[PDB]
Amino acid sequence: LVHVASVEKGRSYEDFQKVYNAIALKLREDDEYDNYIGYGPVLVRLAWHTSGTWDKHDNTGGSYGGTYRFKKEFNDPSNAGLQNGFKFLEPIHKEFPWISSGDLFSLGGVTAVQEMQGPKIPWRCGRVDTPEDTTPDNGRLPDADKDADYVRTFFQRLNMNDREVVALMGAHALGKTHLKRSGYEGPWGAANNVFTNEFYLNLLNEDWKLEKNDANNEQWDSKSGYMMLPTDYSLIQDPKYLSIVKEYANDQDKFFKDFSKAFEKLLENGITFPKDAPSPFIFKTLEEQGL
Ligand code: HEM
């Protein structure tokens, strides 16, 4: 099935910058969430999980249809906690009812990365809501207790290569694991609501110990109070991933540029953009607007 991007009727860059801005202003205002981490990280994860159900083989799932709004997908165990990002976006959607669900979930992620002093992420509009029976089944999002071979094979289904995977994983600088949500507990670093390359630096430079958490799952822990999932740690066990990790630990601009590309790609997988669609939008941050 082909999913052709269809611009919300009559809308242009300024309309979407207004949505961006409302998201960004609420991100700033609602700062208490998650022990003052704020909603940035869970909005990035919402964008990823609503996009990451995609299957390149038959174009099922993906960001286009905004299917997270249906109970099979919002109740996926893999999505535990993302209801907080959805609830955040609800007043945004009420103010701007014309935006599609897929466009809002993906734009939430872009806005969060940028407002957290991350790279600019070009973003295209035109996702169209699809019906409840187009919601992908549970089980398409990745397990955390696995090795590099798992990770590499998993991401082939999203048409991501080694560089794209290692870049995307850098988003684990953000937020934290929550025991009651995933069976893992702890942040990955100190700067967890500012977008930086800290994930790679911590992988290489902390002294990690393989411990069991209080849900009886293994994770890697440091004396600084940071953690890595087994799938994170796999990026330094596999020599191909390791090279790339070192590259991003040593070049913040390269990480930003590669993350931006991979994240846009993730958010656009499955969508066909007509030849005469608008160019991708690059939104100004609140700071750049003086707001
Ligand atoms: C092998 C792939 C991946 C696995 C197994 C994985 C697994 C996890 C797990 C278990 C959590 C903790 C959930 C919780 O307890 O709240 C988490 C959090 C998160 N992940 Fe992933 N993840 C992967 C890839 C990604 C990618 C590709 C992105 C986005 C580019 C991403 C962004 C995030 C963010 C931002 C959080 C923090 C959420 C919060 O603080 O509420 N993850 N991930």
CATH superfamily of 142-262: Peroxidase, domain 2 (1.10.420.10)
Residue 4: beta bridge partners? 272
Overall resolution, Å: 1.4
Q: Is the CB of 127 under 6 A from ligand 1?
A: no
Domains in the chain: boundaries: 1-141+263-291, 142-262
Residue nearest to atom 23 of ligand 1 (CA): 169
CA 81/CA 66 separation, integer angstroms: 17
Nearest CA to ligand 1 atom 32: 45
Q: Which of 19, 47, 17, 18 is nearest to 175 (CA)?
A: 47
Distance CA(79)–CA(169), nearest Å, equals: 17
Is 49 designated active site? yes
Residue 172 in marked binding region: yes
Are 278 and 188 in contact, with CB atoms under 8 Å apart? no
Sign of the Cα torsion 104, 69, 40, 140 reads: negative
Residue 199 CB less than 6 A away from ligand 1 = no
The coordinates were experimentally obtained by X-ray
Q: Is the CB of 151 under 6 A from ligand 1?
A: yes
250 secondary structure, DSSP code: T
Do 1-141+263-291 and 142-262 share a fold? no
Minimal-distance CA residue to ligand 1 atom 33: 45
Q: Answer whether CATH 1.10.520.10 is correct for domain 1-141+263-291.
A: yes
Spatial CA neighbour of 273 closest among 128, 113, 157: 128
Please give the torsion angle defined by the CA atoms of residues 148, 149, 151 and 154, in that order, rounded to the nearest 10 degrees.
180
- Closest C-alpha among 176, 278, 165, 156 to residue 229: 176
